[PDB]
Design an enzyme around this catalytic site. Structure first.
Site, PDB file in Angstrom:
ATOM      1  N   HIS A  29      38.773  38.463  51.055  1.00  0.00           N
ATOM      2  CA  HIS A  29      39.679  37.397  51.479  1.00  0.00           C
ATOM      3  C   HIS A  29      41.105  37.833  51.140  1.00  0.00           C
ATOM      4  O   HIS A  29      41.384  39.035  51.076  1.00  0.00           O
ATOM      5  CB  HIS A  29      39.238  36.042  50.874  1.00  0.00           C
ATOM      6  CG  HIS A  29      39.173  35.976  49.368  1.00  0.00           C
ATOM      7  ND1 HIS A  29      38.223  36.638  48.623  1.00  0.00           N
ATOM      8  CD2 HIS A  29      39.886  35.239  48.482  1.00  0.00           C
ATOM      9  CE1 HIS A  29      38.381  36.350  47.343  1.00  0.00           C
ATOM     10  NE2 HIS A  29      39.383  35.500  47.230  1.00  0.00           N
ATOM     11  N   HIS A  43      43.325  36.690  48.436  1.00  0.00           N
ATOM     12  CA  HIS A  43      43.931  36.598  47.107  1.00  0.00           C
ATOM     13  C   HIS A  43      44.243  37.971  46.500  1.00  0.00           C
ATOM     14  O   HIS A  43      43.624  38.984  46.825  1.00  0.00           O
ATOM     15  CB  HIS A  43      43.021  35.818  46.173  1.00  0.00           C
ATOM     16  CG  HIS A  43      42.768  34.422  46.625  1.00  0.00           C
ATOM     17  ND1 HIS A  43      41.631  33.725  46.288  1.00  0.00           N
ATOM     18  CD2 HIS A  43      43.518  33.587  47.379  1.00  0.00           C
ATOM     19  CE1 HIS A  43      41.686  32.521  46.824  1.00  0.00           C
ATOM     20  NE2 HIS A  43      42.824  32.411  47.486  1.00  0.00           N
ATOM     21  N   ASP A  59      43.558  39.536  44.012  1.00  0.00           N
ATOM     22  CA  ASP A  59      42.455  40.325  43.480  1.00  0.00           C
ATOM     23  C   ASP A  59      41.646  41.009  44.562  1.00  0.00           C
ATOM     24  O   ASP A  59      40.725  41.756  44.236  1.00  0.00           O
ATOM     25  CB  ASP A  59      41.562  39.445  42.597  1.00  0.00           C
ATOM     26  CG  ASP A  59      40.956  38.270  43.346  1.00  0.00           C
ATOM     27  OD1 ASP A  59      41.514  37.906  44.397  1.00  0.00           O
ATOM     28  OD2 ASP A  59      39.948  37.691  42.871  1.00  0.00           O
ATOM     29  N   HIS A  65      34.632  29.842  48.791  1.00  0.00           N
ATOM     30  CA  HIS A  65      35.739  30.106  47.883  1.00  0.00           C
ATOM     31  C   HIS A  65      37.061  30.036  48.631  1.00  0.00           C
ATOM     32  O   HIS A  65      38.052  29.511  48.111  1.00  0.00           O
ATOM     33  CB  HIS A  65      35.537  31.467  47.219  1.00  0.00           C
ATOM     34  CG  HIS A  65      36.764  32.025  46.569  1.00  0.00           C
ATOM     35  ND1 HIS A  65      37.111  31.742  45.268  1.00  0.00           N
ATOM     36  CD2 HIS A  65      37.717  32.867  47.035  1.00  0.00           C
ATOM     37  CE1 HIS A  65      38.232  32.377  44.967  1.00  0.00           C
ATOM     38  NE2 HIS A  65      38.621  33.064  46.024  1.00  0.00           N
ATOM     39  N   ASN A  89      39.656  26.658  39.194  1.00  0.00           N
ATOM     40  CA  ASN A  89      40.709  26.772  40.200  1.00  0.00           C
ATOM     41  C   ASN A  89      40.100  26.891  41.590  1.00  0.00           C
ATOM     42  O   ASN A  89      39.419  27.875  41.905  1.00  0.00           O
ATOM     43  CB  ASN A  89      41.624  27.953  39.898  1.00  0.00           C
ATOM     44  CG  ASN A  89      43.022  27.738  40.443  1.00  0.00           C
ATOM     45  OD1 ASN A  89      43.490  26.602  40.527  1.00  0.00           O
ATOM     46  ND2 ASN A  89      43.691  28.822  40.829  1.00  0.00           N
TER      47      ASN A  89
HETATM   48  C1  LIG Z   1      37.894  34.421  36.856  1.00  0.00           C
HETATM   49  C2  LIG Z   1      38.708  34.037  37.822  1.00  0.00           C
HETATM   50  C3  LIG Z   1      39.468  32.709  37.757  1.00  0.00           C
HETATM   51  C4  LIG Z   1      40.050  32.304  39.106  1.00  0.00           C
HETATM   52  N1  LIG Z   1      40.213  33.486  39.939  1.00  0.00           N
HETATM   53  C5  LIG Z   1      41.200  34.359  39.849  1.00  0.00           C
HETATM   54  C6  LIG Z   1      42.362  34.336  38.874  1.00  0.00           C
HETATM   55  C7  LIG Z   1      40.994  35.322  40.817  1.00  0.00           C
HETATM   56  N2  LIG Z   1      39.892  35.002  41.453  1.00  0.00           N
HETATM   57  C8  LIG Z   1      39.429  33.891  40.924  1.00  0.00           C
HETATM   58  C9  LIG Z   1      38.164  33.243  41.433  1.00  0.00           C
HETATM   59  O1  LIG Z   1      37.792  32.123  40.989  1.00  0.00           O
HETATM   60  O2  LIG Z   1      37.520  33.879  42.315  1.00  0.00           O
HETATM   61 ZN   LIG Z   2      39.944  34.417  45.657  1.00  0.00          ZN
HETATM   62 ZN   LIG Z   3      38.808  36.074  42.722  1.00  0.00          ZN
END
Ligand SMILES: C=CCCn1c(C)cnc1C(=O)O
Ligand SMILES: [Zn+2]
Ligand SMILES: [Zn+2]
Length: 231
Positions: free
Chosen positions: A83, A85, A87, A148, A179
């Site tokens: 996706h 984000h 990460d 998500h 979150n």
């Molecule tokens: C362990 C992740 C907490 C929330 N989050 C971050 C900061 C990045 N991705 C996520 C998630 O929930 O997938």
């Molecule tokens: Zn994400």
């Molecule tokens: Zn994530």
């Protein structure tokens, strides 16, 4: 055993073999005031490697390629993102610099544009509807509807019954949905069942952040997102 967040300094990357020619990569990044782990996947495509999702930002993604040349020595040639984000697309620009063909869904590609994150070059056709799937290299890409984030994909490796859940599956140790800004809670449970339907043989499940498991992870995610509503 598996790497936990504490064992990985920020900006180092570890590789964890799962089945033959299928590793995962773990690294750590800071979101607001903490440091979480994130997971990605690495798959053998004949003589080249296919990278499912960046580390989590430029410096990390950099160390990933570093590790891969050290440990695997085959070149990463393509790369698909789950996706939008940071990460998942943090480090695209590095990969693209490193000569790596960066792929992603159109929806995902737009969402990255809007939210101001890096934007993978190429668009993935024919993953536009719920349940669609397209066969990318040695994996199947599958789109199971919103969860998500409305765009989130998952990745199955048929050769090894590995299912890459991405941020749409949690871990056991994880219990608090927390979150969920850009997350469509109302559809997610179905969306996981779409997975348990299509990849029911899957004998290795991997979440986006934490230790792998089996098909149990799916059900654990549904409850955790269910009780986000009734509580
Ligand atoms: C362990 C992740 C907490 C929330 N989050 C971050 C900061 C990045 N991705 C996520 C998630 O929930 O997938
Ligand atoms: Zn994400
Ligand atoms: Zn994530």
């Amino acid at each position: 055993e598996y790497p936990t967040v504490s064992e990985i300094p920020v900006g180092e990357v570890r590789l964890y073999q799962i089945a033959d020619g299928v590793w995962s990569h773990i690294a750590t990044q800071s979101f607001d005031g903490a440091v979480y782990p994130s997971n990605g996947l690495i798959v053998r495509d004949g003589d080249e490697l296919l990278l499912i999702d960046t580390a989590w930002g430029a410096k990390n993604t950099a160390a990933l390629l570093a590790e891969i040349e050290k440990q695997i020595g085959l070149p990463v040639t393509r790369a698909v993102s789950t996706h939008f984000h940071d990460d998942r697309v943090g480090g695209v620009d590095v990969l693209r610099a490193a000569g790596v063909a960066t792929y992603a869904s159109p929806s995902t590609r737009r969402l990255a544009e809007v939210e101001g994150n890096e934007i993978p070059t190429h668009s993935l056709e024919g993953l536009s509807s719920s349940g669609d799937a397209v066969r990318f290299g040695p994996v199947e890409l599958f789109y199971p509807g919103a969860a998500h984030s409305t765009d989130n994909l998952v990745v199955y490796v048929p050769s090894a019954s590995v299912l890459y859940g991405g941020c749409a599956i949690y871990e056991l140790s994880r219990t608090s949905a927390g979150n969920v800004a850009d997350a469509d809670l109302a559809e997610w449970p179905t969306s996981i069942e779409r997975i348990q339907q299509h990849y029911p043989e899957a004998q290795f499940v991997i979440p986006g952040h934490g230790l792998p498991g089996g098909l149990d992870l799916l059900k654990h995610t549904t409850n955790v997102v269910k009780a986000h509503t009734n509580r």
